[PDB]
Amino acid sequence: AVKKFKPYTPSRRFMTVADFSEITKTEPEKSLVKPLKKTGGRNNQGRITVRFRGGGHKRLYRIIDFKRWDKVGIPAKVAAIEYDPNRSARIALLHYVDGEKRYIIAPDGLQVGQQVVAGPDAPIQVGNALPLRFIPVGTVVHAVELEPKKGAKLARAAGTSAQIQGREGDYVILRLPSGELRKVHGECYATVGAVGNADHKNIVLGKAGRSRWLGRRPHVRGAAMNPVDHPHGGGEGRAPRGRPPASPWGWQTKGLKTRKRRKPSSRFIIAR
Amino acid sequence: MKRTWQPNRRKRAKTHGFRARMRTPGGRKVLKRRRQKGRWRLTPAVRKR
RNA sequence: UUUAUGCUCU
RNA sequence: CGCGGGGUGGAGCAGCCCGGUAGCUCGUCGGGCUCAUAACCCGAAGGUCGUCGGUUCAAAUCCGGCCCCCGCAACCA
RNA sequence: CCUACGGGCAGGCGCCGAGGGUAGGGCCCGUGACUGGGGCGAAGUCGUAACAAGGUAGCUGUACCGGAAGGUGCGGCUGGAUC
RNA sequence: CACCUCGAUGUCGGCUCGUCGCAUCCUGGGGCUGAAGAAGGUCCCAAGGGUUGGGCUGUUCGCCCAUUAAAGCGGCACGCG
RNA sequence: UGCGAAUGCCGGCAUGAGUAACGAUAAAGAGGGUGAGAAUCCCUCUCGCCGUAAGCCCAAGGGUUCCUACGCAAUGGUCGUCAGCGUAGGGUUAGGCGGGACCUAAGGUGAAGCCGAAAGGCGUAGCCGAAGGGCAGCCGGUUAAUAUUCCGGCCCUUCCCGCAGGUGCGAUGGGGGGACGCUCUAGGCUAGGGGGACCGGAGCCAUGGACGAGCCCGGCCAGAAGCGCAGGGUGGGAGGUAGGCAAAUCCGCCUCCCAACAAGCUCUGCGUGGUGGGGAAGCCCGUACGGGUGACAACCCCCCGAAGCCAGGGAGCCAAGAAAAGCCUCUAAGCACAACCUGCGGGAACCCGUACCGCAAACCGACACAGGUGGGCGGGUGCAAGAGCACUCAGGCGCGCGGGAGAACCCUCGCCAAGGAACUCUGCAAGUUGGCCCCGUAACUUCGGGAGAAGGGGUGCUCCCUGGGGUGAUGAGCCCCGGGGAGCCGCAGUGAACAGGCUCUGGCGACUGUUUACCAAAAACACAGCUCUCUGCGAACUCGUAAGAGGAGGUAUAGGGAGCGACGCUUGCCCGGUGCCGGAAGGUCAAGGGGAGGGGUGCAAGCCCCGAACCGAAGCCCCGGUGAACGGCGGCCGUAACUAUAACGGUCCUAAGGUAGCGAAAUUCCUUGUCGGGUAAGUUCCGACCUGCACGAAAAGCGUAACGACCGGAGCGCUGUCUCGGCGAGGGACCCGGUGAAAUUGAACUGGCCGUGAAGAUGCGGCCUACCCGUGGCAGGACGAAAAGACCCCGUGGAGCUUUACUGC
RNA sequence: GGCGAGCUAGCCCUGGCCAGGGUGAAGCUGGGGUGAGACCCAGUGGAGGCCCGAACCGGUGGGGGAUGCAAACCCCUCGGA
RNA sequence: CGUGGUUCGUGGAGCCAUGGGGGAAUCUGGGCGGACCACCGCCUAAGGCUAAGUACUCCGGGUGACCGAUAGCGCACCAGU
Ligand SMILES: [Mg+2]
Ligand SMILES: [Mg+2]
Ligand SMILES: [Mg+2]
Ligand SMILES: [Mg+2]
Ligand SMILES: [Mg+2]
Ligand SMILES: [Mg+2]
Ligand SMILES: [Mg+2]
Ligand SMILES: [Mg+2]
Ligand SMILES: [Mg+2]
Ligand SMILES: [Mg+2]
Ligand SMILES: [Mg+2]
Ligand SMILES: [Mg+2]
Ligand SMILES: [Mg+2]
Ligand SMILES: [Mg+2]
Ligand SMILES: [Mg+2]
Ligand SMILES: [Mg+2]
Ligand SMILES: [Mg+2]
Ligand SMILES: [Mg+2]
Ligand SMILES: [Mg+2]
Ligand SMILES: [Mg+2]
Ligand SMILES: [Mg+2]
Ligand SMILES: [Mg+2]
Ligand SMILES: [Mg+2]
Ligand SMILES: [Mg+2]
Ligand SMILES: [Mg+2]
Ligand SMILES: [Mg+2]
Ligand SMILES: [Mg+2]
Ligand SMILES: [Mg+2]
Ligand SMILES: [Mg+2]
Ligand SMILES: [Mg+2]
Ligand SMILES: [Mg+2]
Ligand SMILES: [Mg+2]
Ligand SMILES: [Mg+2]
Ligand SMILES: [Mg+2]
Ligand SMILES: [Mg+2]
Ligand SMILES: [Mg+2]
Ligand SMILES: [Mg+2]
Ligand SMILES: [Mg+2]
Ligand SMILES: [Mg+2]
Ligand SMILES: [Mg+2]
Ligand SMILES: [Mg+2]
Ligand SMILES: [Mg+2]
Ligand SMILES: [Mg+2]
Ligand SMILES: [Mg+2]
Ligand SMILES: [Mg+2]
Ligand SMILES: [Mg+2]
Ligand SMILES: [Mg+2]
Ligand SMILES: [Mg+2]
Ligand SMILES: [Mg+2]
Ligand SMILES: [Mg+2]
Ligand SMILES: [Mg+2]
Ligand SMILES: [Mg+2]
Ligand SMILES: [Mg+2]
Ligand SMILES: [Mg+2]
Ligand SMILES: [Mg+2]
Ligand SMILES: [Mg+2]
Ligand SMILES: [Mg+2]
Ligand SMILES: [Mg+2]
Ligand SMILES: [Mg+2]
Ligand SMILES: [Mg+2]
Ligand SMILES: [Mg+2]
Ligand SMILES: [Mg+2]
Ligand SMILES: [Mg+2]
Ligand SMILES: [Mg+2]
Ligand SMILES: [Mg+2]
Ligand SMILES: [Mg+2]
Ligand SMILES: [Mg+2]
Ligand SMILES: [Mg+2]
Ligand SMILES: [Mg+2]
Ligand SMILES: [Mg+2]
Ligand SMILES: [Mg+2]
Ligand SMILES: [Mg+2]
Ligand SMILES: [Mg+2]
Ligand SMILES: [Mg+2]
Ligand SMILES: [Mg+2]
Ligand SMILES: [Mg+2]
Ligand SMILES: [Mg+2]
Ligand SMILES: [Mg+2]
Ligand SMILES: [Mg+2]
Ligand SMILES: [Mg+2]
Ligand SMILES: [Mg+2]
Ligand SMILES: [Mg+2]
Ligand SMILES: [Mg+2]
Ligand SMILES: [Mg+2]
Ligand SMILES: [Mg+2]
Ligand SMILES: [Mg+2]
Ligand SMILES: [Mg+2]
Ligand SMILES: [Mg+2]
Ligand SMILES: [Mg+2]
Ligand SMILES: [Mg+2]
Ligand SMILES: [Mg+2]
Ligand SMILES: [Mg+2]
Ligand SMILES: [Mg+2]
Ligand SMILES: [Mg+2]
Ligand SMILES: [Mg+2]
Ligand SMILES: [Mg+2]
Ligand SMILES: [Mg+2]
Ligand SMILES: [Mg+2]
Ligand SMILES: [Mg+2]
Ligand SMILES: [Mg+2]
Ligand SMILES: [Mg+2]
Ligand SMILES: [Mg+2]
Ligand SMILES: [Mg+2]
Ligand SMILES: [Mg+2]
Ligand SMILES: [Mg+2]
Ligand SMILES: [Mg+2]
Ligand SMILES: [Mg+2]
Ligand SMILES: [Mg+2]
Ligand SMILES: [Mg+2]
Ligand SMILES: [Mg+2]
Ligand SMILES: [Mg+2]
Ligand SMILES: [Mg+2]
Ligand SMILES: [Mg+2]
Ligand SMILES: [Mg+2]
Ligand SMILES: [Mg+2]
Ligand SMILES: [Mg+2]
Ligand SMILES: [Mg+2]
Ligand SMILES: [Mg+2]
Ligand SMILES: [Mg+2]
Ligand SMILES: [Mg+2]
Ligand SMILES: [Mg+2]
Ligand SMILES: [Mg+2]
Ligand SMILES: [Mg+2]
Ligand SMILES: [Mg+2]
Ligand SMILES: [Mg+2]
Ligand SMILES: [Mg+2]
Ligand SMILES: [Mg+2]
Ligand SMILES: [Mg+2]
Ligand SMILES: [Mg+2]
Ligand SMILES: [Mg+2]
Ligand SMILES: [Mg+2]
Ligand SMILES: [Mg+2]
Ligand SMILES: [Mg+2]
Ligand SMILES: [Mg+2]
Ligand SMILES: [Mg+2]
Ligand SMILES: [Mg+2]
Ligand SMILES: [Mg+2]
Ligand SMILES: [Mg+2]
Ligand SMILES: [Mg+2]
Ligand SMILES: [Mg+2]
Ligand SMILES: [Mg+2]
Ligand SMILES: [Mg+2]
Ligand SMILES: [Mg+2]
Ligand SMILES: [Mg+2]
Ligand SMILES: [Mg+2]
Ligand SMILES: [Mg+2]
Ligand SMILES: [Mg+2]
Ligand SMILES: [Mg+2]
Ligand SMILES: [Mg+2]
Ligand SMILES: [Mg+2]
Ligand SMILES: [Mg+2]
Ligand SMILES: [Mg+2]
Ligand SMILES: [Mg+2]
Ligand SMILES: [Mg+2]
Ligand SMILES: [Mg+2]
Ligand SMILES: [Mg+2]
Ligand SMILES: [Mg+2]
Ligand SMILES: [Mg+2]
Ligand SMILES: [Mg+2]
Ligand SMILES: [Mg+2]
Ligand SMILES: [Mg+2]
Ligand SMILES: [Mg+2]
Ligand SMILES: [Mg+2]
Ligand SMILES: [Mg+2]
Ligand SMILES: [Mg+2]
Ligand SMILES: [Mg+2]
Ligand SMILES: [Mg+2]
Ligand SMILES: [Mg+2]
Ligand SMILES: [Mg+2]
Ligand SMILES: [Mg+2]
Ligand SMILES: [Mg+2]
Ligand SMILES: [Mg+2]
Ligand SMILES: [Mg+2]
Ligand SMILES: [Mg+2]
Ligand SMILES: [Mg+2]
Ligand SMILES: [Mg+2]
Ligand SMILES: [Mg+2]
Ligand SMILES: [Mg+2]
Ligand SMILES: [Mg+2]
Ligand SMILES: [Mg+2]
Ligand SMILES: [Mg+2]
Ligand SMILES: [Mg+2]
Ligand SMILES: [Mg+2]
Ligand SMILES: [Mg+2]
Ligand SMILES: [Mg+2]
Ligand SMILES: [Mg+2]
Ligand SMILES: [Mg+2]
Ligand SMILES: [Mg+2]
Ligand SMILES: [Mg+2]
Ligand SMILES: [Mg+2]
Ligand SMILES: [Mg+2]
Ligand SMILES: [Mg+2]
Ligand SMILES: [Mg+2]
Ligand SMILES: [Mg+2]
Ligand SMILES: [Mg+2]
Ligand SMILES: [Mg+2]
Ligand SMILES: [Mg+2]
Ligand SMILES: [Mg+2]
Ligand SMILES: [Mg+2]
Ligand SMILES: [Mg+2]
Ligand SMILES: [Mg+2]
Ligand SMILES: [Mg+2]
Ligand SMILES: [Mg+2]
Ligand SMILES: [Mg+2]
Ligand SMILES: [Mg+2]
Ligand SMILES: [Mg+2]
Ligand SMILES: [Mg+2]
Ligand SMILES: [Mg+2]
Ligand SMILES: [Mg+2]
Ligand SMILES: [Mg+2]
Ligand SMILES: [Mg+2]
Ligand SMILES: [Mg+2]
Ligand SMILES: [Mg+2]
Ligand SMILES: [Mg+2]
Ligand SMILES: [Mg+2]
Ligand SMILES: [Mg+2]
Ligand SMILES: [Mg+2]
Ligand SMILES: [Mg+2]
Ligand SMILES: [Mg+2]
Ligand SMILES: [Mg+2]
Ligand SMILES: [Mg+2]
Ligand SMILES: [Mg+2]
Ligand SMILES: [Mg+2]
Ligand SMILES: [Mg+2]
Ligand SMILES: [Mg+2]
Ligand SMILES: [Mg+2]
Ligand SMILES: [Mg+2]
Ligand SMILES: [Mg+2]
Ligand SMILES: [Mg+2]
Ligand SMILES: [Mg+2]
Ligand SMILES: [Mg+2]
Ligand SMILES: [Mg+2]
Ligand SMILES: [Mg+2]
Ligand SMILES: [Mg+2]
Ligand SMILES: [Mg+2]
Ligand SMILES: [Mg+2]
Ligand SMILES: [Mg+2]
Ligand SMILES: [Mg+2]
Ligand SMILES: [Mg+2]
Ligand SMILES: [Mg+2]
Ligand SMILES: [Mg+2]
Ligand SMILES: [Mg+2]
Ligand SMILES: [Mg+2]
Ligand SMILES: [Mg+2]
Ligand SMILES: [Mg+2]
Ligand SMILES: [Mg+2]
Ligand SMILES: [Mg+2]
Ligand SMILES: [Mg+2]
Ligand SMILES: [Mg+2]
Ligand SMILES: [Mg+2]
Ligand SMILES: [Mg+2]
Ligand SMILES: [Mg+2]
Ligand SMILES: [Mg+2]
């Protein structure tokens, strides 16, 4: 669910928080397998290269396991489900029979205390990782690799997933969370199930400050600027765009496509 | 009201110090210039211990 | 597959 | 009194560049279909082209003055 | 003050108290620029929605739309004519 | 019109403080009346003094309320920063 | 090579002028002393001001300002005999305080490596980097000036060596730990404080009373082991093991078995502790201060009590809260007559800082400048509390010109008959209201609010009765919340100080918040939230020549761009033009390919030139799509049985002709539209109408409770705003002594009127008036000062900005 | 071509600060309620870009200052806390 | 093909240089004499060094129809203070 508040202040009236009942003995995280210190910095070497960032709560980085072939065959028990501030999804601490501990992005359903495993073997149930080629066509899946052995990249956002649609050569055909139909190599690992914490999309920040906590500084409209600053600056009492709506740097921002045309990747795609 | 000069001995050496001047080619010319002029002090005098 | 309408009181 | 566009059968529009003949829809009139009206069908009438002057062989048309119509302008002060 | 004085009376203070005052509520009646529909009214305007299968069967709850009656969608009723 | 002023002559209105003109708003004095009286009209003399308080608007001005003997018009760098 | 002008340059000296001013209105007076000289230096007494400071202690910064002697030319806004000033001499003492022979953070640097014309830019490890982590000293005494530094007492750290005991020792490597948020919080303590009839103490009895359980003063500090109280940390065995980049017996994981509890084992805090040390008032001396005594001082009970300690305590919550070393454990090479561990003993223990100022006369502001400057302490009484307010301790100050006088005028204050907004652009300003307890409280509403709504009553002191809590006993005392009854006094009881004026109704913005440092705080920005669009991840996008980096150690519930801007109800039609999106055709199209065909020169082989068809991308053309893409959303004429008006019609054009809802409005020109409401009167205000110059739906449309130092209209309250002023206070103005500027200044022997003049005359004409010179005052003129007009134009002057201007990158 | 973020703006790392009072969200417990619920009532609890108000951060209105104490100050008033 | 250099700014544009593509030969070889061809001549590219004559004046000296303390160097003087 999602937590609501009686309006005992404005903003608290619309404010809505995440449900943390799914969260098992978190609080203190697992200092070992993560965390590392997280270098919080809003610009590159010198200059701001992404506007409107900075501030917001300090964070410890949980170094999660986005490649599971690392431990083929070795099963493991799910010890806890934890809060991770560095992603929308929740994380699951799992103890391997090895005695090795690793975090995984907690899939929807994944219960505390169940066994998990990865490999060409691997029962087709929730939490288990397999090379795409060995997953029954039609199953939903998450944390997919885009190229073999390069680590998961796709469907890692809270509530996201991907469907295996068919096979074609050493490639299988996924339908990515974006809706794009893509061919991915069969050797690429995926893990069965959707991501979970899917109520995520339904929280309401409620106030300006709430955005400040997440590290988002106020965003100012070109419309409020001067010509020096933005295509939309200037006028003299409000103003339509007076030209095709543009970004501070001049390019159009309503329709104009941006994907590089001649791109090797193009040969493996087929949708929106 | 708070004026511009807010002395800080580290700031001063870290900024116009001799070593700072020698790292940058632009700084090495400041010393070149200052020396050629016969300046008595090639660098802001600073102290502390 | 082209039509709509018929002033007032007896 | 700045600039631009206009004024043509009863209504609303063309025709004006480039000269020489005024067209469209509606309406009006006469006849038909209907018990009857309208619709519908067959016919016909009707404009000197705001105005005075000028140009030409010839002026709605090109040129000038006057009277009306519409639009725009009247800023630094 | 009078005494038939461990008294009474006058007088004094106190409670409540008609009402007056101040402040805020409730109900009801009249009235108000303007505005909504309604009823009624011998011979006004626009159409034709319904009654015959009404010339798109009708009616219906709801929804959108339209000068107007209405039209259309969805589902419902027969209180629909026709072999 | 463009004559002094652009190495600067601060621009409306209000307030304050006035002062002057008379083409007189009131008060004084007159002639004429289509002046019975009372009350007016119109013109002449007259500048001594007086010439209200409010509502509206930044307003000047003006409309309005209540009065008044009257609620005068102007000039003074549209008097006066 | 000749100066009078350049708002010329450098310098000197003038004018204003003995004028303004002498820098917070906390405040002064006298006696004595010193001295050539004293309001200004010293001392005494009286008075006043600070006291969450204007007292005290740190960090910056400053750098002799520190202490003392001898000095007053200058510096000191006056004076100085004094000084933060001149001369000289002295003064800063550390194994434990801070920093370094420790750690890491952002960042910086940077073997490897990558990139760049050169300069140079990146960058893994490593190294540097601190107000973070780590680490051993507490109480007194002493100097003119330093002290956790010297001294005294008690107490600890590390290094080296050596004995003894013990163990597989051994690391830069593995593991543990260090180790972490915000809010609220428990128990027990400590600092701190109040009281005491108890303990110690010089003295005091005034002025009517008091020889009193009187008054006045003080009743502690530090301390090892041991011990006691409170609390933090922690399970103990065994087997298995494939993970923790080698190896571990360690950690991790699975299974057994015992504890379940601090029980124990530890580590802190507090108490006690051998001992050591401090120790008032007052009186006597001497200051320029401090010293003697009080003393053989006392040294104790009760109460209040932290935000500090036990500390890694506990609970709740979402935004999910450094690192590394010290440290412990594990093992590796190696070495195990090593080594490491424990205990004792002896020895060894370096560099830098240390004065003084430090909310300020010593720091930042040219000044002994009413400004600015981070952390700690910051006592008492009363007032509901408090760091608030008043008065006060300690301590520190009266602010470096004074003395008089009692005008206008100014500033800052106090009061005011009657009236009570009549003031004015506006109640601007000032008033009123004002704390706490109680009673009570509407529309509307998003059910929270609106609410401190509004409006009221109570408030002191005395005696009596009386209920609970804390600590103690289940008690007394001391604290802490109260409850009831009878009285007392004044004009007045939150008696002084600190403490909302209220209501009604519009506009804009939802809200808290943000902004033009120094004329705008707002209806502007931001904001949650809605939509569009781009982005499949070496993402898009941004910075960079690049390497590289941000995005992000993120992944479509994510990230970038854009507009809108809580929320409610909604957001209509046009794709013709522009943009974007799609379109394997067709048209055009550059280099290049291709060369029919022609040309120059050769005796020629040849060399060398042009050059048609044709094949050649993107782009444009062309065909479609697209509105929360740029954008746009008509005109004339007629018509109903009173008139009017026109549901209706005709016609012209369009890509389509503005829907809902609003509407003289933040928009309405005519305009103070018309009508209604408010007022005695209303250019504004509120409600309507619609003839909308020139509203209208995400440059959103129409509403909306709550909120606002926003802007408008009205009323109650109350007033010096006003009728309309008056009196009074203090700081100035004035006079006297001391010090003593400024802009400005062609030179001046500088009057009025009417004329004249480059058109506004002290300076010309005529007349008028007028003895010479000041002081206090007002501001009409010197087209007064100031700034080489900010407006305007001019210059083939400049700069910011725009675009379907040109040309480039 | 160099010098500047010791002022100011933003961000990164590490610390510190916010008297006192008021309002009383969720949750919890208990009770009622039901077939079971929703839910209602108490008490507990202690949420919030919540309220009043010092420090602290501000700079709303007015007055003063205008060769100033001050090249942005002082007083009163006011905003956040 | 793209550019630079030369007086040569695409010009009839050679020559020298060279970022890109293609790519030889060794005396009967190659370059040049201003597109190109012939003829006639000049010279031997893709390795390197080389005194002197030339430029300057921190420094020492000698001279001046050069200055003489507002001049002359910024500095005649403990001034790049
Ligand atoms: Mg860097
Ligand atoms: Mg850098
Ligand atoms: Mg969302
Ligand atoms: Mg924005
Ligand atoms: Mg702007
Ligand atoms: Mg800029
Ligand atoms: Mg631009
Ligand atoms: Mg624009
Ligand atoms: Mg506009
Ligand atoms: Mg500050
Ligand atoms: Mg300076
Ligand atoms: Mg420093
Ligand atoms: Mg700094
Ligand atoms: Mg020297
Ligand atoms: Mg009909
Ligand atoms: Mg009939
Ligand atoms: Mg009829
Ligand atoms: Mg009849
Ligand atoms: Mg026409
Ligand atoms: Mg016509
Ligand atoms: Mg034509
Ligand atoms: Mg006809
Ligand atoms: Mg006919
Ligand atoms: Mg004509
Ligand atoms: Mg004619
Ligand atoms: Mg203009
Ligand atoms: Mg009564
Ligand atoms: Mg009564
Ligand atoms: Mg009533
Ligand atoms: Mg009616
Ligand atoms: Mg009729
Ligand atoms: Mg009828
Ligand atoms: Mg019909
Ligand atoms: Mg029908
Ligand atoms: Mg029908
Ligand atoms: Mg029917
Ligand atoms: Mg219609
Ligand atoms: Mg149906
Ligand atoms: Mg002129
Ligand atoms: Mg002329
Ligand atoms: Mg002048
Ligand atoms: Mg002037
Ligand atoms: Mg007359
Ligand atoms: Mg008279
Ligand atoms: Mg008479
Ligand atoms: Mg007269
Ligand atoms: Mg007004
Ligand atoms: Mg007017
Ligand atoms: Mg009047
Ligand atoms: Mg005039
Ligand atoms: Mg004037
Ligand atoms: Mg003025
Ligand atoms: Mg004026
Ligand atoms: Mg001259
Ligand atoms: Mg001169
Ligand atoms: Mg004077
Ligand atoms: Mg004077
Ligand atoms: Mg004076
Ligand atoms: Mg003074
Ligand atoms: Mg004496
Ligand atoms: Mg003597
Ligand atoms: Mg004295
Ligand atoms: Mg004396
Ligand atoms: Mg004095
Ligand atoms: Mg220092
Ligand atoms: Mg000195
Ligand atoms: Mg001294
Ligand atoms: Mg002296
Ligand atoms: Mg002297
Ligand atoms: Mg002196
Ligand atoms: Mg001074
Ligand atoms: Mg002397
Ligand atoms: Mg001295
Ligand atoms: Mg020591
Ligand atoms: Mg110290
Ligand atoms: Mg140290
Ligand atoms: Mg050493
Ligand atoms: Mg280091
Ligand atoms: Mg570097
Ligand atoms: Mg380098
Ligand atoms: Mg170091
Ligand atoms: Mg440190
Ligand atoms: Mg430290
Ligand atoms: Mg230490
Ligand atoms: Mg100690
Ligand atoms: Mg000292
Ligand atoms: Mg000491
Ligand atoms: Mg010692
Ligand atoms: Mg070790
Ligand atoms: Mg901690
Ligand atoms: Mg406690
Ligand atoms: Mg103590
Ligand atoms: Mg005694
Ligand atoms: Mg006596
Ligand atoms: Mg006695
Ligand atoms: Mg005592
Ligand atoms: Mg005591
Ligand atoms: Mg004590
Ligand atoms: Mg003790
Ligand atoms: Mg165990
Ligand atoms: Mg074992
Ligand atoms: Mg191993
Ligand atoms: Mg102890
Ligand atoms: Mg002890
Ligand atoms: Mg003793
Ligand atoms: Mg003593
Ligand atoms: Mg606190
Ligand atoms: Mg703690
Ligand atoms: Mg804790
Ligand atoms: Mg290290
Ligand atoms: Mg060992
Ligand atoms: Mg070995
Ligand atoms: Mg030892
Ligand atoms: Mg020693
Ligand atoms: Mg010291
Ligand atoms: Mg001092
Ligand atoms: Mg000090
Ligand atoms: Mg201060
Ligand atoms: Mg301080
Ligand atoms: Mg001091
Ligand atoms: Mg002073
Ligand atoms: Mg000061
Ligand atoms: Mg100073
Ligand atoms: Mg200030
Ligand atoms: Mg401060
Ligand atoms: Mg106190
Ligand atoms: Mg108290
Ligand atoms: Mg009392
Ligand atoms: Mg209080
Ligand atoms: Mg305190
Ligand atoms: Mg205070
Ligand atoms: Mg004192
Ligand atoms: Mg003074
Ligand atoms: Mg009195
Ligand atoms: Mg009065
Ligand atoms: Mg009175
Ligand atoms: Mg009244
Ligand atoms: Mg008035
Ligand atoms: Mg008025
Ligand atoms: Mg105003
Ligand atoms: Mg008003
Ligand atoms: Mg006010
Ligand atoms: Mg109540
Ligand atoms: Mg309200
Ligand atoms: Mg309430
Ligand atoms: Mg009240
Ligand atoms: Mg009251
Ligand atoms: Mg009362
Ligand atoms: Mg009393
Ligand atoms: Mg008790
Ligand atoms: Mg206690
Ligand atoms: Mg008791
Ligand atoms: Mg009071
Ligand atoms: Mg008060
Ligand atoms: Mg209050
Ligand atoms: Mg706002
Ligand atoms: Mg709105
Ligand atoms: Mg605000
Ligand atoms: Mg600000
Ligand atoms: Mg400003
Ligand atoms: Mg500015
Ligand atoms: Mg201002
Ligand atoms: Mg504000
Ligand atoms: Mg960069
Ligand atoms: Mg780039
Ligand atoms: Mg790149
Ligand atoms: Mg990256
Ligand atoms: Mg990253
Ligand atoms: Mg907006
Ligand atoms: Mg349409
Ligand atoms: Mg379109
Ligand atoms: Mg289209
Ligand atoms: Mg289009
Ligand atoms: Mg296209
Ligand atoms: Mg084609
Ligand atoms: Mg070609
Ligand atoms: Mg070719
Ligand atoms: Mg030939
Ligand atoms: Mg093409
Ligand atoms: Mg097509
Ligand atoms: Mg729209
Ligand atoms: Mg258009
Ligand atoms: Mg039409
Ligand atoms: Mg009509
Ligand atoms: Mg009619
Ligand atoms: Mg179309
Ligand atoms: Mg319109
Ligand atoms: Mg429409
Ligand atoms: Mg109106
Ligand atoms: Mg408008
Ligand atoms: Mg009325
Ligand atoms: Mg009226
Ligand atoms: Mg107004
Ligand atoms: Mg209105
Ligand atoms: Mg609009
Ligand atoms: Mg729009
Ligand atoms: Mg809006
Ligand atoms: Mg509105
Ligand atoms: Mg405001
Ligand atoms: Mg007054
Ligand atoms: Mg006085
Ligand atoms: Mg004097
Ligand atoms: Mg004249
Ligand atoms: Mg004159
Ligand atoms: Mg003369
Ligand atoms: Mg003359
Ligand atoms: Mg004269
Ligand atoms: Mg003469
Ligand atoms: Mg004179
Ligand atoms: Mg005078
Ligand atoms: Mg004057
Ligand atoms: Mg004056
Ligand atoms: Mg000029
Ligand atoms: Mg110009
Ligand atoms: Mg130009
Ligand atoms: Mg540069
Ligand atoms: Mg800075
Ligand atoms: Mg504090
Ligand atoms: Mg319950
Ligand atoms: Mg129950
Ligand atoms: Mg409570
Ligand atoms: Mg509750
Ligand atoms: Mg708050
Ligand atoms: Mg507030
Ligand atoms: Mg507040
Ligand atoms: Mg202010
Ligand atoms: Mg302001
Ligand atoms: Mg102001
Ligand atoms: Mg002011
Ligand atoms: Mg003034
Ligand atoms: Mg070439
Ligand atoms: Mg060239
Ligand atoms: Mg050319
Ligand atoms: Mg040429
Ligand atoms: Mg050439
Ligand atoms: Mg050649
Ligand atoms: Mg060449
Ligand atoms: Mg080449
Ligand atoms: Mg040859
Ligand atoms: Mg040659
Ligand atoms: Mg030749
Ligand atoms: Mg060629
Ligand atoms: Mg040659
Ligand atoms: Mg050679
Ligand atoms: Mg050579
Ligand atoms: Mg020489
Ligand atoms: Mg000579
Ligand atoms: Mg000289
Ligand atoms: Mg000289
Ligand atoms: Mg001389
Ligand atoms: Mg020289
Ligand atoms: Mg010189
Ligand atoms: Mg020298």
JSON list of C-alpha atoms in Angstrom, two decimals, chain A residues 193-204:
[
{"chain": "A", "resi": 193, "resn": "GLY", "atom": "CA", "xyz": [9.93, -12.18, -12.04]},
{"chain": "A", "resi": 194, "resn": "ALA", "atom": "CA", "xyz": [9.06, -8.50, -12.02]},
{"chain": "A", "resi": 195, "resn": "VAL", "atom": "CA", "xyz": [11.02, -6.05, -9.88]},
{"chain": "A", "resi": 196, "resn": "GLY", "atom": "CA", "xyz": [8.56, -5.23, -7.11]},
{"chain": "A", "resi": 197, "resn": "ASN", "atom": "CA", "xyz": [7.79, -2.26, -4.90]},
{"chain": "A", "resi": 198, "resn": "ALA", "atom": "CA", "xyz": [5.52, -1.42, -7.81]},
{"chain": "A", "resi": 199, "resn": "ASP", "atom": "CA", "xyz": [3.45, 0.97, -5.72]},
{"chain": "A", "resi": 200, "resn": "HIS", "atom": "CA", "xyz": [6.51, 3.18, -6.02]},
{"chain": "A", "resi": 201, "resn": "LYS", "atom": "CA", "xyz": [5.02, 5.14, -8.94]},
{"chain": "A", "resi": 202, "resn": "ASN", "atom": "CA", "xyz": [2.17, 6.24, -6.68]},
{"chain": "A", "resi": 203, "resn": "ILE", "atom": "CA", "xyz": [3.87, 8.26, -3.96]},
{"chain": "A", "resi": 204, "resn": "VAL", "atom": "CA", "xyz": [3.32, 11.99, -3.74]}
]
